[PDB]
Amino acid sequence: APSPEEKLHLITRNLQEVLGEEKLKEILKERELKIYWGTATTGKPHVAYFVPMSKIADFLKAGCEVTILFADLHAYLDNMKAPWELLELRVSYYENVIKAMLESIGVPLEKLKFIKGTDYQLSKEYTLDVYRLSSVVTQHDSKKAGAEVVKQVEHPLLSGLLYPGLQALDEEYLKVDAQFGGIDQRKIFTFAEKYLPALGYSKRVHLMNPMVPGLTGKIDLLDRKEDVKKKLKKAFCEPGNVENNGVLSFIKHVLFPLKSEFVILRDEKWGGNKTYTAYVDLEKDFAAEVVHPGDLKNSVEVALNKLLDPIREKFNTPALKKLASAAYP
Amino acid sequence: APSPEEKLHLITRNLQEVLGEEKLKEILKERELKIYWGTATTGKPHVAYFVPMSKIADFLKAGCEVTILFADLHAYLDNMKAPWELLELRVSYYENVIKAMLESIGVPLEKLKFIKGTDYQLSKEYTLDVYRLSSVVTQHDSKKAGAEVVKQVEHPLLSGLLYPGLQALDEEYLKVDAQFGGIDQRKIFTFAEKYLPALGYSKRVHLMNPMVPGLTGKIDLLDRKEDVKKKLKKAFCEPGNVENNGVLSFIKHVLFPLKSEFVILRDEKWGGNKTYTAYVDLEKDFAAEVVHPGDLKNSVEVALNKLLDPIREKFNTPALKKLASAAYP
Ligand SMILES: N[C@@H](Cc1ccc(O)cc1)C(=O)O
Ligand SMILES: N[C@@H](Cc1ccc(O)cc1)C(=O)O
Ligand SMILES: [K+]
Ligand SMILES: [K+]
Ligand SMILES: [K+]
Ligand SMILES: [K+]
Numbered sequence: 001a002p003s004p005e006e007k008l009h010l011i012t013r014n015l016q017e018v019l020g021e022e023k024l025k026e027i028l029k030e031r032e033l034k035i036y037w038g039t040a041t042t043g044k045p046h047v048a049y050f051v052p053m054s055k056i057a058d059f060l061k062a063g064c065e066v067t068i069l070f071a072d073l074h075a076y077l078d079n080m081k082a083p084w085e086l087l088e089l090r091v092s093y094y095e096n097v098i099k100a101m102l103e104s105i106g107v108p109l110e111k112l113k114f115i116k117g118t119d120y121q122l123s124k125e126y127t128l129d130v131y132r133l134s135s136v137v138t139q140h141d142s143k144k145a146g147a148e149v150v151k152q153v154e155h156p157l158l159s160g161l162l163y164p165g166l167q168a169l170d171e172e173y174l175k176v177d178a179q180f181g182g183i184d185q186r187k188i189f190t191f192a193e194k195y196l197p198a199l200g201y202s203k204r205v206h207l208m209n210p211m212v213p214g215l216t217g218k219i220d221l222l223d224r225k226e227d228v229k230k231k232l233k234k235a236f237c238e239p240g241n242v243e244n245n246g247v248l249s250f251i252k253h254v255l256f257p258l259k260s261e262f263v264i265l266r267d268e269k270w271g272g273n274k275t276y277t278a279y280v281d282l283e284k285d286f287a288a289e290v291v292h293p294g295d296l297k298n299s300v301e302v303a304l305n306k307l308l309d310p311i312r313e314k315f316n317t318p319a320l321k322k323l324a325s326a327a328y329p
Numbered sequence: 330a331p332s333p334e335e336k337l338h339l340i341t342r343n344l345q346e347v348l349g350e351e352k353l354k355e356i357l358k359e360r361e362l363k364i365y366w367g368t369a370t371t372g373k374p375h376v377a378y379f380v381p382m383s384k385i386a387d388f389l390k391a392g393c394e395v396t397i398l399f400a401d402l403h404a405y406l407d408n409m410k411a412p413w414e415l416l417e418l419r420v421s422y423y424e425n426v427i428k429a430m431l432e433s434i435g436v437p438l439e440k441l442k443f444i445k446g447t448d449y450q451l452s453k454e455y456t457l458d459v460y461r462l463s464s465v466v467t468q469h470d471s472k473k474a475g476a477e478v479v480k481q482v483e484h485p486l487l488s489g490l491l492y493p494g495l496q497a498l499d500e501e502y503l504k505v506d507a508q509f510g511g512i513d514q515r516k517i518f519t520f521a522e523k524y525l526p527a528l529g530y531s532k533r534v535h536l537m538n539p540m541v542p543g544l545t546g547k548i549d550l551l552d553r554k555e556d557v558k559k560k561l562k563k564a565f566c567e568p569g570n571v572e573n574n575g576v577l578s579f580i581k582h583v584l585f586p587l588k589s590e591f592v593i594l595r596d597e598k599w600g601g602n603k604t605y606t607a608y609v610d611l612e613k614d615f616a617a618e619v620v621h622p623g624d625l626k627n628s629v630e631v632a633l634n635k636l637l638d639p640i641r642e643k644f645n646t647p648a649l650k651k652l653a654s655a656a657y658p
Contacts, residue, residue, distance in 0.1 A: 076460065076464065077463065079464075122457060124451045127451050128451060131405065133487075134486065134487040134491055135405065135486060135487075135488045136486070138484045138487065139468065139486070139490060140484055157463065157465070157466065157468070158462075158464075158466050158471050158490055158491075161487055162460070
């Protein structure tokens with residue numbers, strides 16, 4: 001209530017790939033899994049963040065101890081997306097917006113830990129492990145590890161090479177069993193599995209989501225009803241096409257796991273509303289062309305405005321506007 | 330007593346190159362120069378260390394505030410010449426041996442500051458400047474800067490790229506006006522002159538010695554009379570050749586600045602002893618072949634045993650043997 005097998009299924013459902021199944025099952029047989037997710041405090045979170053937030057939700061339902069890392073320094077090291085004062089402001093926008101998302105999807109916040117990188121990444125023992133790690137890692141391996149993650153520019157900065165080793169050490173200093181992120185990470189993840197043990201630390205389990213296409217190709221978490229509508233009307237959803245369909249993906253990765261069902265809103269003329277209890281059923285009806293793109297979008301629009309409603313409320317304070325504007329000028 | 334002009338001459342004599350003459354003279358017009366020298370606590374110091382020690386001696390005679398940096402972390406980052414426990418032991422061998430050298434040449438120790446890198450290089454603000462610097466420096470520039478200094482290996486380690494930026498930041502954290510080292514450094518020095526100002530810190534004066542050939546091509550600071558003799562008898566000193574002559578170089582860079590003269594020990598049959606008050610005079614007599622290699626070596630041998638005598642005494646304790654043996658097993 002839940003058994004280790006129900007835990008495993010909740011944690012790993014919808015992932016593209018699990019590294020470390022063997023240790024993962026060892027742990028779940030005995031105790032709760034410790035896991036984190038990291039986000040560099042970079043650009044404004046948009047509705048696509050509900051994809052990783054839905055997995056965090058599943059981790060909590062499974063009994064996991066979840067940490068969220070606001071990787072402020074990593075934002076700095078990644079070709080200075082975020083500068084030195086103006087990192088701290090984005091940290092608070094990210095903390096606020098992320099907690100409102102999770103509240104909105106009904107995730108208990110109370111056993112979720114939020115930490116920011118500069119709470120621990122400038123400490124002496126951490127900094128010492130960074131040098132230690134620098135003495136066994138090649139520029140080659142460090143460069144290879146960040147290829148998909150750090151912005152690739154004409155003359156690579158030294159910070160870009162540091163970035164992967166810090167993300168690996170994060171696993172140890174957050175004292176987790178596992179890290180969850182997108183499949184893009186994978187080379188950083190495999191990097192951490194190889195080098196952490198050279199520092200005498202255990203390799204971690206790694207859980208990778210697919211790169212899920214976006215709803216519009218961005219819809220902002222604070223956008224008005226009216227802009228959600230207009231952004232959706234532009235959204236690309238081809239009749240009968242179940243590949244490369246950001247609308248269907250949003251349903252699969254966010255709306256189904258939320259209530260374990262999805263309601264298509266459809267006029268009586270075409271069958272009336274239908275409630276699907278599994279994604280594969282909706283997909284089949286869409287391929288068969290008995291769910292129209294316009295009905296699919298409207299069913300997502302309704303459900304998405306339900307998600308965004310609280311968030312827009314909370315952030316309808318003048319301090320939060322100050323924060324938003326200050327954070328992104 | 331000394332004027333700024335006598336100061337400048339003492340500080341810059343025998344150098345191959347001065348960067349920053351303009352600021353250097355500005356400072357000496359008003360106050361004492363702050364300067365350091367750094368040595369990675371790597372292999373056992375040998376008699377060739379008297380070359381940089383003679384310049385440190387001149388810096389003190391000039392009124393300079395001199396810092397000596399025992400760069401323990403740099404020893405680690407430089408392809409792990411020195412490991413983690415066994416760094417600290419070498420630091421104390423280096424501190425002991427260096428102070429005995431300076432005592433031996435009559436340098437007052439009392440206004441010389443000794444510091445080791447790990448006293449300050451793991452601190453938070455230092456570590457933050459390391460990331461800061463990493464965000465403006467390219468792998469390319471950092472790699473280019475260490476080419477002559479860090480051991481170049483088949484697959485370069487990330488630590489090798491860090492090494493130059495740390496040596497630059499050292500200038501700021503030691504609060505010096507200037508750094509003295511060998512000409513090999515030069516690319517690290519020019520690196521520091523370019524990037525320190527991008528962190529909002531001033532560029533420093535840089536003072537570079539030539540790469541002086543060695544006495545035997547090593548003579549250890551603790552070698553017995555008898556091994557100094559045998560090592561010298563092998564030493565290469567071609568008749569009439571004043572280039573590439575480690576014996577003459579040792580005289581020019583160590584023995585002349587020590588007493589401002591040098592005594593050639595020579596039998597009456599060939600003129601008897603002669604006292605030279607300038608290097609250029611000795612050089613001329615050697616080119617002319619009226620100072621023989623065997624007399625040149627014996628004159629150096631005598632003077633060198635005078636240098637090493639105290640040092641061998643001091644280190645004739647069982648703790649110091651313990652230290653030596655422990656440091657180099
Ligand atoms: N690399 C992650 C962010 C992150 C940073 C540090 C970590 O420890 C973990 C994750 C991303 O691209 O989104
Ligand atoms: N690079 C110097 C050692 C050193 C290290 C750090 C410094 O800040 C200065 C000097 C050498 O090759 O001998
Ligand atoms: K981000
Ligand atoms: K990013
Ligand atoms: K050295
Ligand atoms: K060395």
